[PDB]
Design a protein around this ligand. Structure first.
Ligand SMILES: [Mg+2]
Ligand SMILES: [Mg+2]
Ligand SMILES: [Mg+2]
Ligand SMILES: [Mg+2]
Ligand SMILES: [Mg+2]
Ligand SMILES: [Mg+2]
Ligand SMILES: [Mg+2]
Ligand SMILES: [Mg+2]
Ligand SMILES: [Mg+2]
Ligand SMILES: [Mg+2]
Ligand SMILES: [Mg+2]
Ligand SMILES: [Mg+2]
Ligand SMILES: [Mg+2]
Ligand SMILES: [Mg+2]
Ligand SMILES: [Mg+2]
Ligand SMILES: [Mg+2]
Ligand SMILES: [Mg+2]
Ligand SMILES: [Mg+2]
Ligand SMILES: [Mg+2]
Ligand SMILES: [Mg+2]
Ligand SMILES: [Mg+2]
Ligand SMILES: [Mg+2]
Ligand SMILES: [Mg+2]
Lengths: 88, 65, 106, 117, 99
RNA sequence: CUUGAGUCUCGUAGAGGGGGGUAGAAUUCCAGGUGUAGCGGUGAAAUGCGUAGAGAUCUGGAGGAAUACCGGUGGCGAAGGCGGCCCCCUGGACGAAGACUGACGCUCAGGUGCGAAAGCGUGGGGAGCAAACAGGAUUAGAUACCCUGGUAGUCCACGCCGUAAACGAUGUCGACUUGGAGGUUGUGCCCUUGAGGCGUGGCUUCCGGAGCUAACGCGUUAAGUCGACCGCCUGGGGAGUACGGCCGCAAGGUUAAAACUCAAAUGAAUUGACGGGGGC
């Protein structure tokens, strides 16, 4: 999974403060970071189906978090999906 | 029984040959926890340490050599 | 940058060749910004079973904290060197700076 | 014809036979007798009496090598280990140790299918 | 099948699971089996075990006692091993080979 | 808004998964030392093997497949499944104390993926094992069971297949309702401290209460008391068959009838009977 340094940096970046680890923004950011990292793993271990089940789970929960955000306030949703390069 | 809990060791060294020899028979096979009274966690640690020691030729696999 | 326990045996006929290899490997792992927390030369010991029709191999232990790259080329050298008959690289969550039971008897 | 005075007896105790062979301590064999070669066949080929008969017939062909000190290594849990052991013990031999050395694998090869009888 | 063929096969299987898969220190002595006789029905079987330790009843008694107490374990092993219908009830007996 | 659901922090256990190395037994084979007439096999036998020297025995080498002991009325996984050791990449679960988000939840037709074994396509590998087959027997008969051989296959890579008594024959999620005895894995506090005592979570095994059930049984991991959604059933046979569609290289899978026929088919438990049984 993600290293402590990566998560700390992502929380500090997308969060409100240092300990804003619960906001939808930081959750989506952590999920997309781990997904982008796991792409390299699955590029070569293409028949590791259990890890791929975990990856699909995190993709799905990122999708529903993004949907909740888009339903809450579309401005922050668009700003996020453009800061991460998603929903395209 | 449960000697390792009294020791409190986090892990069992495969380098502790003196200790490991008390958990293998003359045949050289591991002794079940059913008779040594070893906790299951420490029995797993024993199995792993003994297999590692066998690899490094610190303990014999069988008695036939 | 993980901790490794590296234990390897040397052909007894190259027993005095050992300190050279020892210091060479320590220099390699330290020049790679990797510390060394322990180094014990158990020396010649009698095997529990033959290895290539042989006994009396030279055991030596090391405890390192290093990146994975230096560790993998180190085990590569282990493979392609023939004075070493059998090596073993394991991981450790912490750093061990103590006395191995093969030196407390000494 | 020579003198070794310290040999080892391999007892291959099959479920259909029993092969006793005395050998030099370095694997060089001296002689051998079989429960089959002792004038036994069928069931009797694998009976303890025939096993001790074979043990004695083999002892009678190595006595000229001059041994009365033996370690024995048995293989196969066939009927005819007890028999040959007590036989060669009653043949004036001194057995220092008896050792089970049947080859047990660590899940090596798949065994043949069970007989439906 | 015929009781004597099943008898031979079950002798093989009992000898095997008796040499290897036992842990009772009461057992030992290179315990062999001379044979096993069973009824026309395969429901019951009598094994004729032959011990090695000195023939003094203090030990062969303990051996047969341990065998009769482990009969359930040996029966389970036999039933998974030898592929027959009913897993016969086992009865152990000292075969007095010395007469 | 924080109680559901999530995020972060520190840890713990694990045959969870993918890749790459490596070790030690054993089978087989090849080459030698020793050593001679049997070995192998069966309820008995022969086919088979050996005087070119087998089998047995020691040493050496090659190769493939699987990992004794540990091993567990254990553990992990959504299920199928997962078992030497080591490294690399990686998934989930759980606990302690907080911090954060603020219903972001549950279920799910169609859809997508995974999915034992056998099987299929292409190439490689091939020790053991072994459908088919070839013999040897047995038998009224043997095209079976038993024996000697033995190809596909079992193994690997990449695709296909998508079915199992794929089972706990028990859909997923949440709440509530007497107990007792264990296993396993965390954890808090206290005692002179290891030891021990008092707690408190997760998973799991076995008795059993009320209640339920046709009964057997289930029984805080419900088959109890309720709620949410989905799948499915409507006498036996015909038949999971025909036809049509969809899928597949094929084998076939999936969806799924009707005519006709019969008055039953079925589940659980009860009393006996039949042994060419067993005890007293
Ligand atoms: Mg996570
Ligand atoms: Mg026989
Ligand atoms: Mg694993
Ligand atoms: Mg080959
Ligand atoms: Mg992990
Ligand atoms: Mg708030
Ligand atoms: Mg569907
Ligand atoms: Mg297959
Ligand atoms: Mg075909
Ligand atoms: Mg194929
Ligand atoms: Mg092919
Ligand atoms: Mg065969
Ligand atoms: Mg089905
Ligand atoms: Mg299953
Ligand atoms: Mg079903
Ligand atoms: Mg529930
Ligand atoms: Mg589980
Ligand atoms: Mg119950
Ligand atoms: Mg319910
Ligand atoms: Mg019901
Ligand atoms: Mg109908
Ligand atoms: Mg059909
Ligand atoms: Mg059709």
């Amino acid at each position: 999974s993600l290293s402590t340094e990566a998560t700390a940096k992502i929380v500090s970046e997308f969060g409100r403060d240092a300990n804003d680890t619960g906001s939808t923004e930081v959750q989506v950011a952590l999920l997309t970071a781990q997904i982008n990292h796991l792409q390299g793993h699955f590029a070569e271990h293409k028949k590791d189906h259990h890890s791929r089940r975990g990856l699909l789970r995190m993709v799905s929960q990122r999708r529903k978090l993004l949907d909740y955000l888009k339903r809450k306030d579309v401005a922050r949703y668009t700003q996020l999906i453009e800061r991460l390069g998603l929903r395209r | 029984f449960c000697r390792f809990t009294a020791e409190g060791v986090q892990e069992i060294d495969y380098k502790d040959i003196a200790t490991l020899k008390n958990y293998i028979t003359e045949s050289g096979k591991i002794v079940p926890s059913r008779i040594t009274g070893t906790r299951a966690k420490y029995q797993r640690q024993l199995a792993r340490a003994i297999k590692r020691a066998r690899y490094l030729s610190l303990l014999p696999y069988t008695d036939r050599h | 940058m993980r901790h490794y326990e590296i234990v390897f045996m040397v052909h007894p006929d190259q027993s005095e060749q050992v300190p050279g290899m020892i210091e060479r490997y320590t220099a390699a792992i330290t020049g790679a910004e990797g510390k060394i927390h322990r180094l014990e030369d158990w020396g010649r010991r009698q095997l529990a079973y033959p290895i290539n029709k042989l006994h009396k191999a030279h055991y030596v232990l090391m405890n390192v904290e290093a990146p994975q790259e230096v560790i993998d080329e180190l085990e590569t050298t282990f493979r392609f060197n023939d004075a070493v008959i059998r090596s073993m690289v394991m991981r450790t969550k912490h750093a061990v700076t103590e006395a191995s039971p093969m030196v407390k008897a000494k | 014809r020579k003198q070794v005075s310290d040999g080892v007896a391999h007892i291959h105790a099959s479920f259909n036979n029993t092969i006793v062979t005395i050998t030099d301590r370095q694997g060089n064999a001296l002689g051998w007798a079989t429960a089959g070669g002792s004038g036994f066949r069928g069931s009797r080929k694998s009976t303890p009496f025939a096993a001790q008969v074979a043990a004695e017939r083999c002892a009678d062909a190595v006595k000229e090598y001059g041994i009365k000190n033996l370690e024995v290594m048995v293989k196969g849990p066939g009927p005819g280990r007890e028999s040959t052991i007590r036989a060669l013990n009653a043949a004036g031999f001194r057995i220092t140790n008896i050792t089970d050395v049947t080859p047990i694998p660590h899940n090596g090869c798949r065994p043949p299918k069970k007989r439906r009888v | 099948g015929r009781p004597q063929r099943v008898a031979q096969e079950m002798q093989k299987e009992i000898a095997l699971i008796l040499q290897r898969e036992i842990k009772d220190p009461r057992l030992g002595m290179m315990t062999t089996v001379s044979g096993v006789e069973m009824s026309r029905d395969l429901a019951y079987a009598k094994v004729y075990v032959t011990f090695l330790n000195d023939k003094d009843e203090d030990a062969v008694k303990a051996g047969i006692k341990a065998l009769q107490e482990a009969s359930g374990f040996i029966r389970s092993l036999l039933g998974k091993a030898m592929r027959l219908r009913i897993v016969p009830e086992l009865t152990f007996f000292y075969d007095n080979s010395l007469v």
